[PDB]
Amino acid sequence: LVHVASVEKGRSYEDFQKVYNAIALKLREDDEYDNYIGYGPVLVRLAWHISGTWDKHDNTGGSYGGTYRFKKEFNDPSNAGLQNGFKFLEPIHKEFPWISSGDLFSLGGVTAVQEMQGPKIPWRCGRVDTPEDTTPDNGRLPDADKDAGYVRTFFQRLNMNDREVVALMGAHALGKTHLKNSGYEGGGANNVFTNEFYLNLLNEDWKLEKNDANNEQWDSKSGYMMLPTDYSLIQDPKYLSIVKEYANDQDKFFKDFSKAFEKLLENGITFPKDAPSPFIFKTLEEQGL
């Protein structure tokens, strides 16, 4: 099953930069969402969830088809709360109706990461909207209540290795969990992209507790939390080494996250050899906007 990237007809880099900028300007404007966290984190999560349905074995799922716009995927219990990212992106789509759904969703994540002072993430256009019957079934996104063996096995389906898994998980520096969405509560409420996920893992004093929803989570005396899946990155000795590396090398973490996150967003897409090179978008700040 082959999904060929097809550039939106007549569009070029500058066109996508304008979409980036509208997203970035709206991020800045709508700053009150979720107790002043802003929409950055949820947009990063949206991009991951529309990508994380991919299965390397048959090339179903992934960002390409923009299938999150369909009821079945939109309502996936694993996607609870992402409706907020979707609503954010509505007026962006109306301003730029020529962009595919998959391109918009993935670009939202790229824009959020960069505008939160994260690394540049190269991004490629050409996802094409596919019909409702291409919508993957629920259940393909990962559970939070599991251990490192689960996380490792799970991410093999997305063609991600130990370093790529640990790198990607560093996005859990961003935002927070909400009891109503996932049955967890707590987090840093942070909207600046850093390597602090790794530092928190290593430097805090963690205690495993059951929460109000009867789910297990790791809680620190300073009031941070980690999922069992997060904490598994320090229980497992291979993951631990990589955690230690990223806790001690901001630039390495930035480079590795960028590669892994672009790979995540491009899994399942065949780019023809006459496709444009990946675009690197300027931040608002770099444009003097």
Ligand code: HEM
């Ligand atoms: C084992 C893998 C993963 C699990 C089980 C997991 C689970 C979760 C859960 C349960 C939440 C809280 C949702 C809520 O209550 O609203 C969350 C938040 C988040 N996750 Fe993950 N996650 C995983 C991997 C990733 C990856 C790979 C990324 C990005 C590259 C990511 C980005 C985020 C972000 C940005 C949020 C915050 C959303 C917000 O503040 O609204 N996660 N994750």
